């Protein structure tokens, strides 16, 4: 039960992916819907408007799914590699009330990436039953930048 839910394939549409904010200027728009694993082109990742531990990227499955893992990736803009080292994960059924992913009575801090190109697969044990998913970058290199994939089934 570790099938891509549609981040890379775009089975999860752009409108399903949202964030706390995103970085936009004259030349680049690092929109939330660009947070798709292995995405190509320019500005090929999500970046929040500012770098703090309270920024989040949201995926609405529009349907309760069984999430058994997430895969994360950074990105390299020119000479600057950008990626998140650690993150939290929260979920919701209505998209308004949120709950952090606890493990062994303690809120789990997942270990993310060490570079801008290698995907890192983090396991979600116990598996998550949720319609909404949120990822919360806690520490990062250079800038918060994210391409991801959700793994599981229905």
């Amino acid at each position, epitope marked *: 039960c570790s099938m891509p839910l*549609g981040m890379e*394939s*775009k*089975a*999860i*549409s*752009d*409108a399903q992916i949202t964030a706390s904010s995103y970085f936009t200027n004259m030349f680049a728009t690092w*929109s939330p*819907s660009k947070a798709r694993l*292995h995405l*190509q*082109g*320019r500005s090929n990742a999500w970046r929040p408007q500012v770098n703090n531990p309270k920024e989040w990227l949201q995926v609405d499955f529009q349907k309760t799914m069984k999430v058994t893992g997430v895969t994360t990736q950074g990105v390299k803009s020119l000479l600057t590699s950008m990626y998140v080292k650690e993150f939290l994960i929260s979920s919701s059924q209505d998209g308004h009330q949120w709950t952090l992913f606890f493990q062994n009575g303690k809120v789990k801090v997942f270990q993310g990436n060490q570079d801008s190109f290698t995907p890192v697969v983090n396991s979600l044990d116990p598996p998550l039953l949720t319609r909404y998913l949120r990822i919360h970058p806690q520490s990062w290199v250079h800038q918060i930048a994210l391409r991801m994939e959700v793994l599981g089934c229905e």
Partner: antibody
Amino acid sequence: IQLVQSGPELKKPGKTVKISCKASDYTFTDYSLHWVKQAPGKGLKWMGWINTETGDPAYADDFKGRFAFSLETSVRTAYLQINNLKNEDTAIYFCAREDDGLASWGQGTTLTVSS
Amino acid sequence: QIVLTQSPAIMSASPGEKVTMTCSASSTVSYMYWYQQKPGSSPRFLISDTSNLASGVPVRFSGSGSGTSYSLTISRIEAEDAATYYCQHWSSYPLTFGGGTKLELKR
């Protein structure tokens, strides 16, 4: 940055054809590559795409089976292979570079399937 | 799963006129893209991200829209604008083209 496709092809049904799409420079591995079918007199129909950095192909629903997207990065070339050709495969095939839209298009390849 | 509808299929116009071609999506998309195709030619990229002009595109071309409603407008029709125009999205699987709108000139 240009895309140059191979020359016209004539193949008997049931056989195999491999259409090439060559880029003018090596930056093509920074952009995804799409394939489009234009049947005689018809509009534009998407066949799927391939990640040029990864090599992973993804296929549109109608094109799962006899269709294969491959890659040869050393010669800046993408390929479209069609196995077990049908008469309905007769069309023009385009490759297109993705860059906030299909920004570069090959000149197209005319495929005829007849005995 | 998003479908694109261009209407009408064929649209007539005199040179110098202002024409607007519409493309409605069954569901929200991020950006709409537009292409021009003439007989015997490859499609030509017109509009990137709903309203950005592609390389080499004359300024009389403009794109607009949001949500599920998008349009392509030519301010002053030239004879070289006789062609088929396609809209396109890539917000979800599968990538989809509109059915096309043929632009015929009156003379």
